[PDB]
């Protein structure tokens, strides 16, 4: 039905009416015993009409309506992505669902997710009704709907009651791997955005760029048990593609850990011997000794015996006070030697994997949560930030570029003299430019990586530099060597879309100003990469669908 008593016609009806018209006309035509030409033409018209009714469009031009649209047949309703099978039978739309944008929840634990209050109310309304009937406050479901709409203060308390242990499945579209759906035990937050634990953001492949995700709630006791047992984020911490752990600290937490464990040769309070990590905490929180001070502290470590008993040992050893602070949160079974290093993402991954392989799941979960908290805290206290002065430009760059300019100039003259061919000259120009790039990159890394420092005796010493970008890239927290190379040194010798190197180097760095022709050359690779990345998803999804549908039968 439509407005004003009008109607919209389902496509099947038009085809059926056409077939009825033709059939009745043929019946009345045969009744009158007309010559064979008329009946044969009419019956072939009926044949084509029923052909369209069944599988419109398979043979010849499909019959079309006033909207010049190719009309849907019975066959067309089954075949295709829009057909009954793919659209309806699999992927039925479900009740008790919501969707919202995500927000980092730092204060959360590993397994509890923040949920907007309004969404919780709507999703659990059946349970609110049930408990309200249980407490007798609402005599009828009408009353329950009233008070739940009237948001009486008791309703919120009931809502806290019902969600006390009821997990929710949480999905981010599109699911790419079985880690794409996880169950959390919710907590209530104000606002209209789902708070997520930072760690699992890697597993969900989320990036908090205004990306949306959805929530469903199981209903049966059975489904709740599957959620708590199977889908709980505390379990399944190891990816099924490969045994490597999926919950890996990255970005800010890695930065905080690396800044915390790093040493500086001269710092406030260095040299003093301290009884234990407790007093190390006292010293630093009193601001009496900097985080990077190298001191001697007493520590204790434990190890499983042949029977698994944690035999203890203790001694005095050199330690940065920050690493001493770290030793608090370590579980009781870890050996100390692992922490004794400049922690990076690879090291931290090895660390968490270590405590998983040695101690139980609960120690690893607790350890991950505590390392999360501490990493964020001391990264905050770090104040590590990037300034315009950080991308220091090596003075050798002007010299190296000068040398390369001469080398290319003389080579070009040699080509103009007829001594070398165009292709040969092209190749050797590429070679000399590559050599220049290597030289300048090496020089820039050498300048950046080390800083001049003063010792206790005032003598010149050298240490790993504390330049912000260097520590950001070295720690592995959202960076690598290529980007820092492009930041201040040569950008390189990338190619045209055909793959040919343009033979004219991208000279300046991003701190310097890329010239118009330079930048416009630089954009070709960017456009090609963006287009390829955008277009790959279709084929990747298709390949996945085929593979899944081939392998769906097997079961141990």
């Amino acid at each position: 039905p439509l407005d004003g008593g009008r109607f919209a016609t389902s496509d099947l009806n038009d085809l059926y009416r056409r077939v009825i018209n033709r059939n009745n006309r043929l019946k009345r035509l045969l009744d009158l015993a007309a010559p064979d030409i008329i009946v044969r033409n009419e019956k072939r018209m009926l044949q084509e009409a029923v052909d369209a009714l069944l599988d419109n469009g398979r043979r010849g031009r499909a019959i079309t309506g006033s909207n010049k649209r190719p009309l849907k047949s019975l066959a067309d309703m089954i075949k295709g992505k829009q057909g009954r099978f793919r659209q309806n039978l699999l992927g039925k739309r479900v009740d008790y669902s919501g969707r919202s944008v995500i927000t980092v929840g730092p204060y959360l634990r590993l397994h509890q997710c923040g949920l907007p209050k309004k969404m919780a109310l709507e999703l659990f309304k059946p349970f609110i009704y049930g408990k309200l009937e249980l407490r007798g406050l609402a005599t009828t479901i009408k009353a329950a709907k009233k008070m739940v709409e009237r948001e009486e203060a008791v309703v919120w308390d009931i809502l806290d009651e019902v969600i006390r242990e009821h997990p929710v499945l949480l999905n981010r579209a599109p699911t790419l791997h079985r880690l794409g759906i996880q169950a959390f035990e919710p907590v209530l937050i104000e606002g209209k955005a789902i708070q997520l634990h930072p760690l699992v953001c890697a597993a969900y492949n989320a990036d908090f760029d205004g990306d949306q995700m959805a929530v469903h709630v199981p209903l049966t006791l059975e489904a709740q048990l599957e959620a708590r047992a199977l889908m709980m984020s505390t379990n399944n911490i190891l990816s099924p593609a490969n045994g490597e752990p999926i919950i890996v600290p990255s970005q800010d937490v890695v930065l905080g850990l690396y800044y915390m464990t790093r040493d500086c040769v001269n710092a406030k309070g260095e040299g003093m011997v301290l009884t234990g990590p407790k007093e190390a905490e006292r010293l630093y929180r009193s601001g009496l000794a900097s985080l990077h001070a190298r001191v001697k502290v007493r520590i204790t470590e434990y190890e499983k015996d042949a029977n698994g008993e944690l035999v203890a040992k203790t001694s005095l050893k050199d330690t940065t006070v920050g690493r001493a602070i770290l030793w608090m949160i370590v579980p009781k079974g870890l050996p100390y030697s692992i922490v004794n290093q400049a922690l990076g993402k690879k090291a931290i991954s090895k660390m968490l994997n270590t405590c998983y392989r040695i101690l139980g799941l609960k120690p690893t979960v607790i350890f991950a949560d505590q390392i999360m908290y501490t990493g964020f805290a001391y990264a905050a206290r770090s104040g590590a930030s990037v300034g315009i002065d950080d991308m220091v430009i090596p003075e050798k760059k002007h010299e190296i570029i000068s040398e390369a300019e001469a080398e290319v100039a003389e080579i070009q003259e040699q080509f103009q003299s007829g001594l070398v061919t165009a292709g040969e000259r092209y190749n050797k120009v590429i070679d000399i430019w590559a050599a220049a790039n290597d030289r300048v990159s090496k020089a820039m890394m050498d300048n950046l990586q080390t800083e001049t420092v003063i010792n206790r005796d005032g003598q010149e010493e050298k240490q790993v530099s504390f330049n912000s970008i260097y520590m950001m890239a070295d720690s592995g927290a959202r960076g690598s060597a290529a980007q820092i190379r492009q930041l201040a040194g040569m950008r390189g010798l990338m190619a045209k879309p055909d793959g040919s190197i343009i033979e004219t180097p991208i000279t300046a760095n991003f701190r310097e100003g890329l010239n118009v022709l330079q930048y416009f050359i630089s954009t070709h690779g960017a456009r090609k990469g963006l287009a390829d990345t955008a277009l790959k998803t279709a084929n990747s999804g298709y390949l996945t669908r085929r593979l899944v549908d081939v392998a769906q039968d097997l079961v141990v």
Binding site: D95, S100, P106, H216, T504, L517
Partner: protein, 1341 residues
């Protein structure tokens, strides 16, 4: 010097390169095209007159009647754009066409006319272009994106060897006509040449050659080269050209004139060729073996019996030579072929084609292009000739002819629009050359082979189609009807042309909705250039080759603006300086260079011309007269980068801003960030939302002024003067004494759009920005629009931003925001939605809106008025009623017992149901306007009379001010005339206006002027009277509503939106972000001066994104506000004007050899005071895109403001209080708010409506539908196991009605047990398959 408005707030520049060409009007690409489409033109190369000349005259095929066209006229539109949009109709103009019908006498000549009839026929409607470059088609605002289609012409392209094995390349030649069928020539791996039409089945090529009057032999003479043989005394001789032996091995001796010399077994070296040349060898004698295996060139016939022997193309042999010798042909003609050059390909084609004459080829082509029908001489001939060699079905447009002549290196630049046989032969020749290797393919995506087709051309083509439709209509009319009892308006029919135009402008893929978020969106949408649409290409098949940036795109298409996603590369943008050629190719400006010196003359070059020259770019440095500084200058020769001497350059790049479009040019410090994030930032600027208040960007690029000016968002005074009246709604300007038209009122009025719904449901408002008695120059901005400040574009706000990982709240691009900005409302926005209710003639009475409504509480009714419409200014929540409408139920008969029971229960058993309109779920706000419309003849309620009454008083006061102005002017003229003679000025001023008019000046010429002025008063009186009464008619008249609708009502609901956690928040340079925490003001970090930081960005984004622009901007912003504070403090200190003039003068003078060179000594003290007032907290900075502020100048600016030079300052933690160990970057950043409001996307369904077809829940928030649990999630559950959860999902929460009902009862009861059941969707499938004529059933039932 500077204008008054620019004097208000002068934006300091840093550009070093001097500017030459001012930025052209941004909207040209639309306006110029429609001008070419709509204005009169006698020559009429392109336009409506061109269409009329291309269709009319139309003559009866064998009669004595003719219909000829004279002229076209466009009538004035019924409504203006404002009236049109408020009414909600098409802003159209009528096409009036002068038409003549002529009838001849029967006697020859045909020109012996005997009767004519002439009149102006109405010819439908055309949507007219608005001054801001948009269409108003259905009350809505719509725009056309121009299409970058493949240019008509001829293209030679290879498959690069993918299709065939061994990488063997197969070449193709393709002809693209502007309208009609295509034509392709292709090479098969067997090196045979084939032709095809409209991608039908392949054919041998020469048949088309045979299709024309071209027998085999003559075709051979055209295509190949000849060789002559003679047989004398059983000795074979042939003529020689030395170049022929290039590439041949000397297997046999070479002898001539008694001289034998050849390197037997070796190649014929060039030395041998030169020796033959110097010997001048004309003929040589060859053995029988050489002529064996050769192919004859022509047929040979013997007269001994009258028989034909060894027809052409037949390969010679001993028997053939004996036969020809004995028969008597002493002269033999063959063709010459080499494997390296002059391939035998045509010979093989002639050996393979089954056809033997013109008829057989025509039969073949008929059999090919139309299967399933019998061949026939006349029909085949007719369809062939009309398909290819007639303007009826085929026309290579003028641009096509130009491209064609250029491709085949002809001399003529113009020619026929229809193909010719010699052209086909030339195409064959060129293709054979390409396959031989003496030619080159052409890049398909080279921008010289793409053409920008604008609005006018598309509308012209559609109108031409409609015209041919009406042409057949009138043809059959004239053919059938009598000749002297009719008149052209009878013959014509407007419906087809009008339908075609309307369908093109409404439903075509290239007529999408015109988005109106911010003026930048306006400009970038109107300047967008797309490759989609008709005749273009589809999204799902565009390969990477089309999408990549070709080197010819320089200065013509910006690499940056192009959208991300599946549309990447296919939707380009037009650069700032580029413009469209006459043929439709892309032009760019350049500066001519001479004697190593560039000069100010400007050339416009197309792509192909640019290919020839060698041009250097703006990074090159110039001095004095513009002489090149560096000896070796980098250029762009022939599409590749290199360096040359000063003497070798041809043209120089017009300006540093050449390569970038508007959207990306608005980004500061573009040359410091990676192209990926720059592209994303330029794209994402377009989604900014106008805030309640606007603030200028501290760091700008200088384009904001131009972008705002050209964009139609702002009101621009058409004539300069001094402002007479200022009000929030209207502005009144008084023009200058030298500006008035002779005999004019001299006063202008503008009405400001106050609060109306945008196209994207945002808010459009305008603010007066001038003071009383303010002088105004022409082109000055008179009313700031949304996202605009004093004529400067202002998308977002300036915020104090510090980079530090302050807590977990910045984990991935997550922005943590101070409550201080929420309290100041810096980011609040306003949204306006609309709701509609429609009245239609239901059975047993139409739907009626009324105050009374059953089953509704009293308070809800009280919100409505007596008419049933909410009062303006009443807040509404979700689900409240706005328009109280009821609808008759029909008969709804009940038995007397049931009716009595209903009466006992109450007022039930009524045949009227509720149909009132309610607020959509979750929506809330306040009502700002109610619009009502009603079919003519239907009564208008008191409310509608009320709105119409306010309308009429507004119109009446407008015209009353108009008449008072005109009375003032006319009586000023009266007083001036009286002063000029018979002066009674004191009495005139004392006496009322009637005495001014009545005075008779003793019948002088001054008295004649007084009488003329009285007549002027009279005529203006009647003019205003008739215009006002016409306005009353149009307001009072009914409405052309949809059929079946008696009356409609529309209500506008306005709501105010604030920053909310989870909302998205933009920063240009691609710094995306979600707001993740609102902190109380006392927790954020602060500086030693106690000022807290508003936004804490995650530093981790910068190193991996290489958005090093943003940090730079931050530092620059830090300097800007610094200066402002001092200026601010220096205003608070209330010190001398002169010393602050000194300070600001130093601030502007700080630039190292910048171009601006402002001199404050020329400013009056009021100007300096006003400037300082604007300069408080400001000091805007303009940095051109690639001629921007070097870091050194930013350091100098920082040191001027006493800020630390490093740009990193110490901070204190709000909650802890000790210093952060390392200094933290603190600065000022321009942050935007994006349309992705978190409170709009958040949604929760639980239980609700179900789709009728499959009982599944609906989809979409607007209909309160649930989410979709797609197949991906099915596999996700499948992997984990959790089979029970999946079953619960599928059976209860989605499909099984019985199961979900039982489950609902269980949950209400507290029992949580599953009740499985057969999904109804599967039953649906079972029935559907059962409809196919297939038995499907369950087993073991």
């Amino acid at each position: 010097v500077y204008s008054y408005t620019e004097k208000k707030r002068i934006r300091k520049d840093f550009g070093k390169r001097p500017q030459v060409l001012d930025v052209p009007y941004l909207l040209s690409i639309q306006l110029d095209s429609f001008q070419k489409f709509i204005e009169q033109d006698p020559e009429g190369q392109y336009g409506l007159e061109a269409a009329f000349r291309s269709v009319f005259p139309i003559q009866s095929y064998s009669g004595n009647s003719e219909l000829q066209y004279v002229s076209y006229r466009l009538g004035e539109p019924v409504f203006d754009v404002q009236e049109c949009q408020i009414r909600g109709v098409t802003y159209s103009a009528p096409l009036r066409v002068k038409l003549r019908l002529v009838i001849y006498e029967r006697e020859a000549p045909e020109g012996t006319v005997k009767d004519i009839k002439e009149q102006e026929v109405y010819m439908g409607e055309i949507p007219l272009m608005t001054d801001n470059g948009t269409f108003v088609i259905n009350g809505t605002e719509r725009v056309i994106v121009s299409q970058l289609h493949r240019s008509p012409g001829v293209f030679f392209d290879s498959d690069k060897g993918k299709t065939h094995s061994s990488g063997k390349v197969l070449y193709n030649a393709r002809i693209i006509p502007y309208r009609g069928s295509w034509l392709d020539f292709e090479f098969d791996p067997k090196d045979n040449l084939f032709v095809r039409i409209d991608r039908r089945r392949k054919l041998p090529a020469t048949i088309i050659l045979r299709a024309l009057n071209y027998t085999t032999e003559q075709i051979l003479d055209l295509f190949f080269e000849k060789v002559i043989f003679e047989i004398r005394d059983n000795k074979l001789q042939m003529e020689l050209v030395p170049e022929r032996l290039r590439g041949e091995t000397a297997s046999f001796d070479i002898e001539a004139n008694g001289k034998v010399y050849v390197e037997k077994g070796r190649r014929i070296t060039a030395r041998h060729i030169r020796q033959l040349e110097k010997d001048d060898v004309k003929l040589i004698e060859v053995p029988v073996e050489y002529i064996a295996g050769k192919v004859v060139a022509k047929d040979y016939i013997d007269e001994s019996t009258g028989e034909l022997i060894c027809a052409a193309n037949m390969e010679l042999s001993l028997d053939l030579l004996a036969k020809l010798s004995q028969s008597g042909h002493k002269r033999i003609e063959t063709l010459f072929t080499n494997d390296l050059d002059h391939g035998p390909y045509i010979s093989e084609t002639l050996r393979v084609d089954p056809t033997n004459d013109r008829l057989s080829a025509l039969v073949e082509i008929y059999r090919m292009m139309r299967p399933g029908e019998p061949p026939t001489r006349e029909a085949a001939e007719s369809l062939f000739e009309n398909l290819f060699f007639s303007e009826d079905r085929y026309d290579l447009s003028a641009v096509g002819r130009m491209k064609f002549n250029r491709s085949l290196l002809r001399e003529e630049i113009e020619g026929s629009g229809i193909l010719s046989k010699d052209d086909i032969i030339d195409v064959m020749k060129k293709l054979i050359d390409i396959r031989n290797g003496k030619g080159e393919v052409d890049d398909i995506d080279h921008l010289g082979n793409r053409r920008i087709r604008s609005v006018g051309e598309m509308a012209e083509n559609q109108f031409r189609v409609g015209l041919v439709r009406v042409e057949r209509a009138v043809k059959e009319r004239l053919s059938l009807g009598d000749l002297d009892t009719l008149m052209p308006q009878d013959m014509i029919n407007a419906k087809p042309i009008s339908a075609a135009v309307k369908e093109f402008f409404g439903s075509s893929q290239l007529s999408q909705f015109m988005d109106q978020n911010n003026p930048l969106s306006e400009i970038t949408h109107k300047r967008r250039i797309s490759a989609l649409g008709p005749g273009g290409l589809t999204r799902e098949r565009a390969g990477f080759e089309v999408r990549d940036v070709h080197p010819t795109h320089y200065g013509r298409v910006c690499p940056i603006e192009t959208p991300e996603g599946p549309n990447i590369g296919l939707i380009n943008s037009l650069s700032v300086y580029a413009q469209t050629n006459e043929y439709g190719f892309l032009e760019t400006p350049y500066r001519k260079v001479t004697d190593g010196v560039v000069t100010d003359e400007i050339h416009y070059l197309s792509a192909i011309e640019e290919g020839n020259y060698v041009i250097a770019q703006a990074n090159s440095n110039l001095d004095e007269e513009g002489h090149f500084v560096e000896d070796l200058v980098t250029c762009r020769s022939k599409g590749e980068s290199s360096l040359f001497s000063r003497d070798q350059v041809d043209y120089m790049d017009v300006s540093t801003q050449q390569v970038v479009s508007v959207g990306a040019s608005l980004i500061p410090f573009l040359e410091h960030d990676d192209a990926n994030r720059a592209l994303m930032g330029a794209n994402m600027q377009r989604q900014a939302v106008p805030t309640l208040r606007a603030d200028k960007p501290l760091v700008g690029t200088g384009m904001e002024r131009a972008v705002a000016v050209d964009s139609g968002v702002t009101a621009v005074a058409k004539r300069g003067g001094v402002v007479q009246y200022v009000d929030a709604s209207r502005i009144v300007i008084k023009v200058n004494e030298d500006e008035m038209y002779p005999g004019e009122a001299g006063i202008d009025i503008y009405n400001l759009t106050k609060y109306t719904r945008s196209n994207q449901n945002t808010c459009i408002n305008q603010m007066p920005c001038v003071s009383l008695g303010e002088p105004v120059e022409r082109g000055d901005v008179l009313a700031d629009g949304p996202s605009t400040d004093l004529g400067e574009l202002a998308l977002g706000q300036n915020m104090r931003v510090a980079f530090m990982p302050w807590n977990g709240y910045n984990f991935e691009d997550s922005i943590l925001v101070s409550e201080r900005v929420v309290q100041e409302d810096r980011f609040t926005t306003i949204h306006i939605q609309e709701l509609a209710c429609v009245s239609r003639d239901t059975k047993l009475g139409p739907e009626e809106i009324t105050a009374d409504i059953p089953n509704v509480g009293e308070a809800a009714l009280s919100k409505l008025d007596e008419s049933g419409i909410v009062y303006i200014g009443a807040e509404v929540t979700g689900g409240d009623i706005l328009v109280g409408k009821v609808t008759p139920k029909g008969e709804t008969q009940l038995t007397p017992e049931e009716k009595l029971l209903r009466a006992i229960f109450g007022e039930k058993a009524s045949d009227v149901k509720d149909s009132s309109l309610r607020v959509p779920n979750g929506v809330s706000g306040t009502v700002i306007d109610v619009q009502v419309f009603t079919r003519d003849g239907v009564e208008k309620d008191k409310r509608a009379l009320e709105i119409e009454e306010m309308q009429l008083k507004q119109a009446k006061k407008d015209l009353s001010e108009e008449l008072q102005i005109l009375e003032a002017g006319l009586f000023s003229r009266i007083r001036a005339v009286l002063v000029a003679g018979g002066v009674e000025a004191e009495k005139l001023d004392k006496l009322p206006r009637d005495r001014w008019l009545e005075l008779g000046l003793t019948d002088e010429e001054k008295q004649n002027q007084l009488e003329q002025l009285a007549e002027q008063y009279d005529e203006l009186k009647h003019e205003f009277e008739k215009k006002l009464e016409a306005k009353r008619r149009k307001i009072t008249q009914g409405d052309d509503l949809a059929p079946g609708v008696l009356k409609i009502v529309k209500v506008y609901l306005a709501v105010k939106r604030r920053i909310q956690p989870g909302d998205k928040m933009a920063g240009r340079h691609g710094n995306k972000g979600v707001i993740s925490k609102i902190n109380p003001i006392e927790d954020m970090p602060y500086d030693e001066n106690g000022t807290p930081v508003d936004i804490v960005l995650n530093p981790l984004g910068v190193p991996s994104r290489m958005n090093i622009g943003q940090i730079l901007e931050t530092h620059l912003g830090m300097a800007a506000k610094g200066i402002g504070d001092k200026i601010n403090a220096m205003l608070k200190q209330q010190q001398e004007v002169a010393k602050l003039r000194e300070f600001i003068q130093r601030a502007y003078d700080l630039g190292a050899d910048v171009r601006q060179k402002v001199d404050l000594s020329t400013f009056s003290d009021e100007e300096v005071m006003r400037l300082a007032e604007n300069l408080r907290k400001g000091m805007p900075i303009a940095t051109p895109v690639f001629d921007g502020a070097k870091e050194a100048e930013i350091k100098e600016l920082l040191k001027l403001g006493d800020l630390p030079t490093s740009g990193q300052i110490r901070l204190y933690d709000g909650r802890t209080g000790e210093q952060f160990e390392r200094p933290v970057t603190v600065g000022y950043m321009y942050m935007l708010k994006l349309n992705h409001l978190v409170d709009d996307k958040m949604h929760a369904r639980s239980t609700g409506s179900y789709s009728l077809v499959t009982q599944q829940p609906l989809g979409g928030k607007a209909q309160f539908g649930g989410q979709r649990f797609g197949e991906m999630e099915v596999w996700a559950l499948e992997a984990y196991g959790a089979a029970y959860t999946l079953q619960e999902m599928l059976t209860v929460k989605s499909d099984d009605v019985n199961g979900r009902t039982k489950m609902y009862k269980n949950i209400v009861d507290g029992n949580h047990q599953m009740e499985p059941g057969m999904p109804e969707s599967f039953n649906v499938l079972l029935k559907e398959i059962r409809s196919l004529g297939i038995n499907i059933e369950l087993e073991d039932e």
